[PDB]
Design an enzyme around this catalytic site. Structure first.
Site, mmCIF file in Angstrom:
data_model
loop_
_atom_site.group_PDB
_atom_site.id
_atom_site.type_symbol
_atom_site.label_atom_id
_atom_site.label_comp_id
_atom_site.label_asym_id
_atom_site.label_seq_id
_atom_site.Cartn_x
_atom_site.Cartn_y
_atom_site.Cartn_z
ATOM 1 N N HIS A 94 62.031 -3.924 21.502
ATOM 2 C CA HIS A 94 60.596 -3.467 21.962
ATOM 3 C C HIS A 94 60.752 -2.824 23.442
ATOM 4 O O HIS A 94 61.357 -3.523 24.431
ATOM 5 C CB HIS A 94 59.803 -4.507 21.922
ATOM 6 N N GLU A 96 58.912 -3.176 25.788
ATOM 7 C CA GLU A 96 58.527 -4.048 26.759
ATOM 8 C C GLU A 96 59.918 -4.667 27.356
ATOM 9 O O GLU A 96 59.954 -5.150 28.488
ATOM 10 C CB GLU A 96 57.485 -4.903 26.581
ATOM 11 N N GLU A 166 58.532 4.329 19.227
ATOM 12 C CA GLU A 166 57.595 3.938 20.143
ATOM 13 C C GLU A 166 57.627 5.203 21.233
ATOM 14 O O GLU A 166 58.586 5.464 22.026
ATOM 15 C CB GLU A 166 57.724 2.772 21.148
ATOM 16 N N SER A 212 49.830 4.263 19.925
ATOM 17 C CA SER A 212 48.516 3.713 20.102
ATOM 18 C C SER A 212 47.692 4.127 18.886
ATOM 19 O O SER A 212 47.396 5.063 18.518
ATOM 20 C CB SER A 212 47.780 4.319 21.245
#
Lengths: 249, 250
Positions: A94, A96, A166, A212
């Site tokens: 991910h 993050e 992403e 989003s």
């Protein structure tokens, strides 16, 4: 075409026993008429309660990260432990983690290979940043990210891989991604797979949009030919997640 | 001071199976512990539920092996608020493995500790010097520096929720062996540091655990040391021998 879509909820580092039980009650009472794989990725601590309370057959639970082997790694969780615990899905690489926790393309690639080898269904995340996007580096970056993973799998391994795109460049930057941009990135990814691995693999591969997503824009997004679902952040901790699932019909 | 209540903490690290841990917890629930001792079991996050449900011995508490200070957009991690919500009140922070493999610096550890104390947890804060630092005669500077970082963020009163664990990193997997004397020496320096900078009242009540290589055969000799208040155990904690370790704190 459209292979089975996936609606994955990434709860991130959030949730209370009360708050999550309520959401799970919501999910268990939800009628889902189509063929869709719903996934709930909760924090490690909540895996137990999720496994026990989530009874809807269209849902599966997953972990948000792991290390390949058990051992002297205080604070971490390995695949073997997850497996032993009844978890068969996992989200890896991910943005993050790549940004805050030192995960490079190669480490991500090693985790994926280990996961697949252990029988997990894996949601492997890829995506370029603002800088890479603005310098016209999307294709180079994303393709490099995917090649890393690919370098370690056998053709048959692809059956257990799910790619999540992403748009890091549109996350917290003030930029907005459009359904067209999402489609463009997904098509570039699928083309690569078709050319480097095979059209059969490419035709069956699920590529999720990890930007989003909300109840309002989900349908527009799923409509694109190369979008096979979503890896949702914030909306996943709300009843609106149901709308998102419904948008995959 | 006479010695404060000792602590025998099990750090299971990244290990365990539901089956294996169940057996171990069964063992623990069937053990008679006569003295005043705080026993702590730090399992992986996944196993907190099962531990919390099966561990009934009133002398044991459960703990987490790590956490981040706040909840939010941090895929893969667990925050203090979540652990608290889950009913976990103890946590191990700054373990040498985290400091070495996961970028935790003195300051990061310090922030975690402070956030933990503010949230009402009892924390086992880990400190320790490496081979290189040891050999260059830098033990005191290093450990003292690590503790000061933590200290800078707390107030006197906060010390009641802190437990220090001294890890002799220089003796872990380096082929070197630590002796009870070296352990006592490192623990004594820490205590004197607390005594001088924080206070003697604080220093006499502070538990300083030994987190090097402890087993059933050497635990007693280590506990004998004047400044050793218990242990933060590694490999031996996944074994029945952990019981021997607890008994040695008598």
């Amino acid at each position: 075409s459209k292979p089975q879509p996936i609606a994955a909820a990434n709860w991130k580092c959030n949730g209370s026993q009360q708050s999550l039980s309520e959401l799970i009650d919501l999910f268990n009472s939800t009628s889902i008429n189509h063929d869709v794989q719903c996934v709930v990725a909760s924090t490690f601590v909540h895996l137990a309660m999720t496994k026990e309370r989530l009874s809807h057959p269209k849902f599966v639970i997953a972990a948000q990260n792991a290390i390949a082997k058990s051992g002297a790694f205080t604070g971490e969780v390995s695949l073997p432990i997850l497996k032993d615990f009844g978890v068969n899905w996992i989200v890896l690489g991910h943005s993050e983690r790549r940004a805050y926790y030192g995960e490079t393309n190669e480490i991500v690639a090693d985790k994926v290979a280990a996961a697949v080898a252990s029988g997990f269904m894996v949601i492997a995340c890829i995506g370029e940043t603002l800088q890479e996007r603005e310098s016209g580096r999307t294709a180079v970056v994303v393709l490099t990210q995917i090649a890393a993973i690919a370098k370690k799998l056998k053709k048959a391994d692809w059956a257990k891989v799910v790619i999540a795109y992403e748009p890091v460049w549109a996350i917290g930057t003030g930029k907005v991604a459009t359904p067209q941009q999402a489609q463009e990135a997904h098509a570039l990814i699928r083309s690569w797979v078709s050319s480097k691995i095979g059209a059969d693999v490419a035709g069956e591969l699920r590529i999720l949009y990890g930007g989003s997503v909300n109840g309002k824009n989900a349908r527009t997004l799923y409509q694109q030919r190369d979008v096979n679902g979503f890896l949702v952040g914030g909306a996943s901790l709300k009843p609106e997640f149901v709308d998102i699932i419904k948008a995959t019909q």
